Design a protein around this nucleic acid. Structure first.
Lengths: 100, 215, 126, 100, 82, 136
RNA sequence: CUUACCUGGCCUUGACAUACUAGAAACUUUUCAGAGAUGGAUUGGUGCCUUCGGGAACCUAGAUACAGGUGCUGCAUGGCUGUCGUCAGCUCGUGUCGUGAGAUGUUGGGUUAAGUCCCGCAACGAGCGCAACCCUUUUCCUUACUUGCCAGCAUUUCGGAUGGGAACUUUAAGGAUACUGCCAGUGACAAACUGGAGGAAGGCGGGGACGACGUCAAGUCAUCAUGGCCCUUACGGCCAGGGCUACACACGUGCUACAAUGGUCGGUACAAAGGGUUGCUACACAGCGAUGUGAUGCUAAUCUCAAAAAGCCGAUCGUAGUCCGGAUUGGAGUCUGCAACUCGACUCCAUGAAGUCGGAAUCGCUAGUAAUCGCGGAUCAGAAUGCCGCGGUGAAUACGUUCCCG
């Protein structure tokens, strides 16, 4: 991918990590039954007033070597091209050709 | 057609993995990414030290990197400064204490990676490719392998049309799973582009199976 | 007294054979209660009817895995092995009948690029 | 009523049985009764990776990875047994968990 | 549709604008890009210029429009025939 | 094939009557692996014919089969015995399918009884084969 | 968001690197304007080493070499892949014949899944291909006895529930076995071939992976790398909204049906494999329902997803565009998410379209296969009729090579 896209991903990750705590606090306050309806309402308003990049749903998994946005394979953290190359070189412990 | 990777097809049959550690599914990705970074950094740093194999292990909350080299003096350093610097950088990159170990290759002409590196260096120094190929093949066969195949592909000699030329002496039984076949690939960067080099070396058939190999 | 193990299509049956009136229980159930279709009941009874010994033995049977046909086949195989263990002279008759052979047929795996084990997607020259 | 439970996990069954045999041999030498090793069911994960860089859907490599598990029980442990167990080395590629 | 236990959703910057206009009585159209905001009963009688991807189209809010999104009255695709 | 001769697949006798003919008829009736439904259909018809004439179900079925059995196909040549029976069962199931009654078993029994007197679409198709054989 | 496209709003050594010059800990609070990017005020902190004159990160300001480009060339290339095709061939060294390029060997007769093997033969010898070595399934043995198992004993709330047992199933490592081994007939008298016993399995037992010398200037500069060409206040970088989801039409690949071998209702059986700590959830309550609340176990042969479905027994529908079919539309909702208008999935009430087995033509499949029934996973906040796997039930037909294709 392009350097701009990789840096965009990095910036979004940093923003999510920075705003993680307050988002959880507001969500718990919203879910609190004992809290007043007004408390929940201003909690919801503050949550909506949080920055957009703080939301984890805007993060997209990218290959750790090239930045490819397709074919991610969460377990290895690499896209399919690099996974094929590295597995066939033998640098992934335990992975072998499968036949049954 | 296309051929399977000679090491990949034997990774569980007669060959050992280059990485030997266990990790839970949460930590597997981080461990693998740090291992790949370590491999790339070492390859960049030890370009002129004749390094073929790097083995990474994580025994217990630490790391052990074994480097197979034909230039142990250059790798070690004048008084051991280089190895301690390498340990510092590896620990910094890997987040855990790291131990570097050196394994000295005594027969460099039977190592596939070193032959490919030498051929690529000659091609970049613009010796004629057929002389380079024949010299390398003869040197390995004199060294004592039972077979070697060398292939070069690209704009050979600067021609506008690329082509592929190969040369083989001896025996290369690629379809035998129990055969011991070392494989290597390399790039030569010349003014007219990239030339690819591939080397196969056959060193006899391993008997007893993976039980003998002691995985 | 005598023991037998039967296998058919991922189904395994343990059979305990003794001498008695003819009682037959499967998984603490009667034969008619366990098997709903008549052919499954007939397959289980085939060896004793062939030997004409439906009344001299008592059977204790457990079975796991597979479907109704596989379980009936496994029970038949287990009964045959139990009879063979009880008396070796009965082996030629059961082997001629075909009960001693373990049927090794099994489901073939799905294959890459195909809809099933052998079925291929529709293809067109046009 | 002290019982020691040892759980072994690996990606390589030859390694895992080698480690289990070594542990059992050491425990028997120290003079304690042991039970096992017991082989737990193996985990198998498979992946399908496209081989061509652009378009060949039927051209895939199938890879697999296996996780092997072993369970070992130590009963009536002598005093030397425990200190021997921490003196025992750790081999790369095998993970050991001890419960008292 | 949005779950009833959460209430309707209105963008804060648009809500402030309509509240200020209604506290005042300005007839100036409110220019907005918030096609996703829900039309509330306070919106009736106002002119809102909703972005449609290329332009801002004016919409006059009536009683019958309460309960709809602002974007339903600003089509985004152009088609006249083949 | 081209080079080999493939042996015919031997089918097991019916577990209730020990009749390979009945087993083959059941296999012809069965659709998409539903053996139980076909077994019920065939056994119901066998019991129905037994009540409506007290005759042995197996013998009555063989006699009707031999009645509805053709002798020639189509170029005239002598049809091998297995294909005769295979073609007779197909006619007997196809024609039985087109009657109007509550269950398939009752239709099958009814047309078995009808064919036992030579009255049925299967026998009519047999006479058609006779005519077009006289044509050649 | 992805996003590479459009509209509009912004930045210019740049979101990112190295090299130079100066100043600052970095960070942190509260707001205001704005659609946001941004811009302006506003708090606390001001840190770590130190031969301590400064240094380590980190940030800000200036300067230019430069960065940056999913811009072009797959007809300049590396790497990777498809295809003929799992087709059976492709070669080399001595000796002979030919002025010569070359030939012989590698041909001829049988046979085989195979240049697989046996005979003759100016030939005598070798390598890569085929086969075998690797994985899985079928029979048995040894080791191992928990979280898995329960034959015998005992207690039971009748639930392996509890003492207990190591027998059986299973789990999973290591082994044994099958080799024309034995008999009969044939073929040449060889290679072989046919029939029989024993054996779980008989002649290659079944499936997978493995794809020779080469062809197509085949595919990919948008995974990546790379020669050359081009842009540099823009073909680079940031943001909000829109589009990739359009719709007189044509084609390919699928799903669901046109019903009685069926639809609906009540009762009642039998799997395999896989997933689960930002997760899967026993049980109770509320709701017609999707779901909500409380609560329990589980880092898992221990708890859970989880109800298998077709099947069996009973009742009803009686050939009707129907108690078949389930498109479309109206009205209410639930959940994920900052946000379901363009443009999500699912639930309830109402509506109830085409469709009566489909021309010329054309496709898949030789056995646990076709057909039919359900179950799981990768991607993933949510979003499969696709893809990759798992088991249940379980057929028909092969006379033969005369024509079609390779």
């Amino acid at each position: 991918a392009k350097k701009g896209m990789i840096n965009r991903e990095l910036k979004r990750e940093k923003t999510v990590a920075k705003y993680a705590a307050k988002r959880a606090e507001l969500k718990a306050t919203i879910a609190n039954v004992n809290a007043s309806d007004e408390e929940r309402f201003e909690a919801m308003l503050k949550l909506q007033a949080l920055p957009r990049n703080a939301s984890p749903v805007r993060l997209r998994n990218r290959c750790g070597l090239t930045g490819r946005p397709h074919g991610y394979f969460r377990k290895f953290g690499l896209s399919r091209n690099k996974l094929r190359d590295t597995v066939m070189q033998g640098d992934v412990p335990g992975v072998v050709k499968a036949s049954w | 057609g296309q051929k399977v990777h000679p090491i990949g097809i034997r990774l569980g049959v007669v060959k050992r993995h280059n990485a030997n550690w266990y990790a839970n599914p949460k930590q597997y990705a981080e461990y693998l990414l740090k291992d790949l970074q370590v491999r790339e950094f070492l390859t960049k740093k030890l370009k002129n030290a004749m390094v073929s194999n790097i083995l990474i292990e994580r025994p217990s909350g630490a790391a052990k990197v074994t480097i197979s080299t034909a230039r142990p003096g250059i790798v070690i350093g004048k008084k051991g400064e280089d190895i301690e610097k390498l340990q510092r950088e590896l620990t910094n990159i890997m987040g855990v204490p790291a131990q570097v170990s050196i394994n000295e290759i005594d027969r460099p002409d039977l190592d596939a990676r070193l032959v490919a590196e030498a051929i690529a260096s000659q091609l970049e120094k613009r010796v004629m490719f057929r002389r380079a190929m024949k010299r390398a093949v003869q040197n390995t066969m004199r060294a004592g392998a039972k077979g070697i195949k060398v292939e070069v592909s690209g704009r050979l000699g600067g021609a506008e049309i690329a082509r592929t030329e190969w040369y083989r002496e001896g025996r290369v039984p690629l379809h035998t799973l129990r055969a011991d076949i070392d494989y290597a690939t390399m790039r030569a960067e010349t003014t007219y582009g990239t030339i690819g080099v591939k080397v196969w070396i056959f060193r006899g058939e391993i008997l007893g199976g993976m039980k003998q190999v002691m995985n | 007294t005598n023991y037998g193990t039967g296998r058919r299509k991922t189904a395994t049956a343990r059979v305990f054979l003794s001498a008695g009136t003819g009682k037959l229980v499967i998984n603490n159930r009667t034969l008619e209660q366990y098997f709903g279709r008549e052919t499954a009941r007939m397959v289980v009874r085939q060896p004793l009817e062939l030997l004409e010994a439906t009344e001299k033995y008592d059977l204790y049977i457990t079975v796991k895995g597979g479907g109704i046909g596989g379980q009936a086949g496994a029970i038949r195989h287990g009964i045959t092995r139990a009879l063979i263990a009880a008396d070796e002279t009965l082996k030629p008759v059961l082997r001629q009948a075909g009960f001693v052979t373990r049927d090794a047929r099994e489901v073939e795996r799905k294959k890459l690029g195909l809809r099933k084990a052998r079925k291929r997607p529709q293809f067109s020259k046009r | 009523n002290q019982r020691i439970r040892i759980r072994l996990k690996s990606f390589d069954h030859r390694l895992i049985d080698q480690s289990a045999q070594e542990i059992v041999e050491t425990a028997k030498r120290t003079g304690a009764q042991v039970c096992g090793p017991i082989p737990m069911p193996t985990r198998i994960e498979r992946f399908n990776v496209l081989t061509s860089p652009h378009v060949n859907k039927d051209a895939r490599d199938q890879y697999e990875i296996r996780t092997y598990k072993r369970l070992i029980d130590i009963v009536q442990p002598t005093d030397k047994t425990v200190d021997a167990l921490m003196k025992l080395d750790l081999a790369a590629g095998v993970d050991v968990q001890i419960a008292l | 549709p949005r779950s009833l236990k959460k209430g309707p959703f209105v963008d804060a910057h648009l809500f402030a604008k309509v509240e200020a206009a209604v506290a005042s009585n300005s007839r100036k159209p409110i220019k907005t890009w918030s096609r996703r905001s829900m039309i509330l009963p306070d919106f009736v009688g106002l002119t809102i210029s909703v972005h449609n991807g290329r332009n801002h189209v004016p919409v006059i809010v009536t009683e019958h429009m309460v309960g709809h999104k602002l974007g339903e009255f600003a089509p985004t695709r152009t088609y006249r025939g083949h | 094939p081209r080079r080999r001769v493939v042996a015919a697949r031997e089918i097991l006798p019916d577990p209730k009557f020990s009749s390979q003919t009945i087993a083959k008829f059941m296999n012809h009736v069965m659709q998409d692996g539903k053996k139980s439904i076909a077994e019920s259909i065939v056994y119901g018809a066998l019991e129905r014919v037994q009540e409506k004439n007290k005759v042995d179900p197996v013998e009555f079925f063989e006699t009707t089969l031999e009645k509805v059995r053709p002798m020639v196909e189509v170029v005239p040549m002598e049809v091998r015995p297995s294909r005769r029976t295979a073609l007779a069962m197909r006619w007997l199931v196809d024609a039985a399918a087109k009657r109007s009654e509550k269950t398939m078993a009752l239709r099958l029994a009814g047309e078995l009884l009808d064919a036992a007197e030579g009255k049925g679409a299967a026998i009519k198709k047999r006479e058609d084969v006779h005519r077009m054989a006289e044509a050649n």
